[PDB]
Amino acid sequence: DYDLKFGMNAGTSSNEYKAAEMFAKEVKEKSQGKIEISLYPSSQLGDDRAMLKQLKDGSLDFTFAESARFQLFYPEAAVFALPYVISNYNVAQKALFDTEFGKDLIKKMDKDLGVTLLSQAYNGTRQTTSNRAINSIADMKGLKLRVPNAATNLAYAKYVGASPTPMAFSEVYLALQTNAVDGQENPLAAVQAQKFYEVQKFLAMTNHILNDQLYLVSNETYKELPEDLQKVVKDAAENAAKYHTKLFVDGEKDLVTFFEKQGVKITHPDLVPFKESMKPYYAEFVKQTGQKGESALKQIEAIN
Ligand SMILES: [Zn+2]
């Protein structure tokens, strides 16, 4: 029998975990018991980068990773988290699987990083909560928008006309409550997790950054497996991914609905001038990441 480990940063109550449970179920049934995958949630084995390294050395069998996270190896890969570059999840898939940039990055993942990409999932979009309504981009002006201390997030707050306000995540509730800070952005699960709906009366569907999740196997594991058991593992991660995606899609819907119950009001501002405002940031991406950057941007922009 094959005794396989699967690590991930997410927790037992997460969509990522519920879905890896499925993947593990199916690999056990359909390998007629030969393979069995244990779960190591909550960064138990290290952070993402350590788990990625462990996939390369073969000491961890599976792990999760966003596609933007690969910019640690290839800087042009941060294209995936550039604000308004990935309009939707259909863009994230065609970007990864149906472009020369993305086809090639999967080939790099393998050749350089010892990692086989089995499947991709949707892991949620970042949206914007505030003490007052965002009906358009003209509302962004004046807002103390809390972002984490990450270039793409600050570039979002900055270029839309907001006032970016990095602060520690645990300080964010009271900052919002006492209106020291006006809004924040983050996936909807954080809004709920951190109770921001209590201190934020408005939620804007700003669709500004989108997160994905890759089902990754160690090359040392995958190719030591027999051809039939490889396909069992691959099929199961394509099934698990479709589920994972549907968990996030369906749960985002229910969370909008939940928030409305809490007295939050939702807006759907026009995002054409939001993405127009980013062109200065894109210029700076292509400057830093050069020719590889420019074609990634242009090939992904060329999508739907
Ligand atoms: Zn065993």
UniProtKB/Swiss-Prot annotation:
Changing residue 63 to R: Complete loss of incorporation of N-acetyl-beta-neuraminate into the LOS. Part of the tripartite ATP-independent periplasmic (TRAP) transport system SiaPT involved in the uptake of sialic acid (N-acetyl-beta-neuraminate). This protein specifically binds sialic acid with high affinity. N-Acetylneuraminate (sialic acid) can then be incorporated into the lipooligosaccharides (LOS) as a terminal non-reducing sugar, protecting the bacterium from complement-mediated killing by normal human serum. Belongs to the bacterial solute-binding protein 7 family. GO terms for cellular component: outer membrane-bounded periplasmic space. The gene is siaP. The complex comprises the extracytoplasmic solute receptor protein SiaP, and the fused transmembrane protein SiaT. Changing residue 48 to A: Complete loss of incorporation of N-acetyl-beta-neuraminate into the LOS. SUPFAM superfamilies: Periplasmic binding protein-like II. It is found in: Periplasm. Keywords: Periplasm, Signal, Sugar transport, Transport. Pfam families: DctP. The keyword Amino-acid biosynthesis does not apply. N-acetyl-beta-neuraminate binds at residues 9, 48, 66, 126, 146, 186. This is Sialic acid-binding periplasmic protein SiaP.
